């Protein structure tokens, strides 16, 4: 509703592999406290096309820049894999 559960779209080799061939799959990063139903509702109220299904990924934080004078940890991400129906492809940028 508030639409803070759609933080940032991400484009990788896996994302572009899915994002072709009839049904498109768009991968965003979402609020780690959000649920699948909230993700579907946010997509409904801000894009307008109902997701067919949603998959979720949790990437655990890990040490980064090891050995550098000040080491730091990573950031917690929840990934969501929306798949729109056959023949529909909306643009993530441009509204």
């Amino acid at each position: 509703d508030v639409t803070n559960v759609l933080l940032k779209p991400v484009l990788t080799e896996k994302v572009y592999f899915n994002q072709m061939g009839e049904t498109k799959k768009y991968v965003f990063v979402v609020n780690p406290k959000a649920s699948k139903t909230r993700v579907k509702l946010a997509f409904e109220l801000v894009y307008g096309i109902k997701p067919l299904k949603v998959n979720t990924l949790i990437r655990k934080p890990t040490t980064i820049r090891g050995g550098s004078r000040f080491p730091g940890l990573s950031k917690l991400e929840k990934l969501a894999v929306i798949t729109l129906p056959k023949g529909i492809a909306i643009s993530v940028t441009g509204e």
């Binding site: 991400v10 484009l11 990788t12 080799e13």
Partner: peptide, 30 residues
């Protein structure tokens, strides 16, 4: 031709070399 010249190396953030998008190479590195 021109797009061939702009696909060599110049690795994008989330991508690698070689498999550079055939159409999307003018957004990050503009």
């Amino acid at each position: 031709k021109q797009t061939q010249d702009l696909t060599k190396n110049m690795k994008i953030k989330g991508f690698r070399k070689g498999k550079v998008p055939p159409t999307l190479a003018k957004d990050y590195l503009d």
